[PDB]
């Protein structure tokens, strides 16, 4: 994981209503992540939750079957000085 931001974001395992996502943690120390997921081009604002900076996976539930989704991972780290929020990585996946 040579990069300074999260990479290799991917759905590992999926069910019609839930996802198991994973990404390569950057080479830098991360305090926490913010995961966002929403219906690609939906009217509702996306959802959000936090995962510790020591983990590289997460689970998302309550999804509609057969819908396009966009997921985004935000890493928070002092490496991003003078910013604390890092550059995002996004993927798309249909349930």
């Amino acid at each position: 994981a040579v990069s300074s931001v999260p990479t290799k974001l991917e759905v590992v395992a999926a069910t019609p209503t839930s996802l198991l996502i994973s990404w390569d943690a950057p080479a830098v120390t991360v305090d926490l992540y913010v995961i966002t997921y929403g219906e690609t081009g939906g009217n509702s604002p996306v959802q959000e939750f936090k995962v510790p900076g020591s983990k590289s996976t997460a689970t998302i539930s309550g999804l509609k079957p057969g819908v396009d989704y966009t997921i985004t991972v935000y890493a928070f780290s002092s490496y991003y000085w003078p910013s604390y929020k890092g550059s995002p990585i996004s993927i798309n996946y249909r349930t």
Binding site: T29, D31, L32, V51, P52, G53, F76, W81, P82
Partner: protein, 280 residues
């Protein structure tokens, strides 16, 4: 204290004592040439690197060599402050302030939180943009000291920078001691089963006293240097980083302690001007 804490303390003071003797010798014998002093220090810097690698394993050496390096910078800073031309003496005090900040930061964590003490506890970046900012303050000083030596000879201004740095340092370390194991160099998004809310001591003055101390300390370093370009740049960069950091940090604190932190936000401010936190 903790084993890793004792390693850093032995190496820091031992290295400080070694080069204190070297500089004392070089001063009393009129050894003045900058490159001769450089090579004498470099010669013994190699010796401490290899004596430490022999007496320590990988984990301990990584801690010991950084502590020894910071002791090197401390003594060299005081050495420069005392003997260098008035055009340059300012930079010596800046070097020493920097070395004490990073080492005492490690020692504070070792005292307060021995479980997760690492080379990261020296809080050294090791971030391209941050490193550029640091180097850019070195080039400004020496370019400005070459063209405008009188600028760096205004010692009373630089000593004001010394004062805020000492004050910011005292504020910072007191906060770490007051927070105990509730302090962490890394913002926490999950509540530990032992994490409690701290509202006493300096936490009764400010909600983020360690960031207040860090904020003014960082500005102080550039007042020491009398760098008219870096002072505002450091102030703004420092300010926006703690605004972002505090904002996310207090959102996690509200989920940790709920109304207890909400009441704490109404009674105490953040401590940095124009930063409100996760609140209207």
């Amino acid at each position: 204290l903790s084993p890793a804490g004792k390693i850093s303390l032995q190496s820091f003071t031992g290295s400080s004592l070694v080069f204190f003797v070297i500089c004392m010798f070089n001063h009393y014998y009129g050894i003045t040439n900058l490159v001769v002093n450089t090579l004498i220090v470099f010669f013994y810097a190699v010796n401490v690197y290899f004596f430490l690698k022999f007496f320590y394993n990988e984990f301990a050496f990584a801690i010991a060599i950084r502590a020894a390096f910071l002791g090197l910078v401390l003594v060299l800073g005081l050495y420069i402050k005392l003997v260098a031309p008035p055009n340059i003496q300012i930079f010596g005090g800046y070097m020493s302030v920097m070395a004490l900040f990073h080492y005492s930061e490690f020692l504070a964590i070792a005292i307060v939180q021995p479980k997760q003490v690492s080379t990261d506890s020296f809080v050294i970046n090791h971030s391209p943009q941050y490193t550029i900012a640091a180097v850019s303050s070195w080039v400004e000083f020496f370019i400005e000291t070459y063209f405008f030596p009188g600028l760096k000879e205004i010692h009373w201004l630089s000593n004001i920078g010394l004062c805020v740095c000492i004050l910011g340092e005292v504020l910072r370390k007191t906060a770490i001691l007051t927070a105990g194991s509730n302090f962490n160099h890394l913002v926490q998004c999950e509540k530990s089963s032992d994490h409690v809310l701290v509202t006493h001591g300096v936490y009764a003055w400010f909600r983020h006293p360690s960031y207040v101390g860090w904020f003014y300390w960082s500005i102080g370093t550039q007042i020491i240097l009398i760098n008219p370009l870096c002072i505002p740049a450091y102030t703004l960069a420092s300010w926006m980083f703690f605004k972002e950091r505090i904002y996310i940090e207090e959102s996690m604190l509200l989920s940790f302690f709920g109304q207890q932190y909400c009441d704490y936000q109404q009674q105490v401010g953040t401590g940095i001007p124009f930063i409100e936190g996760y609140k209207i």
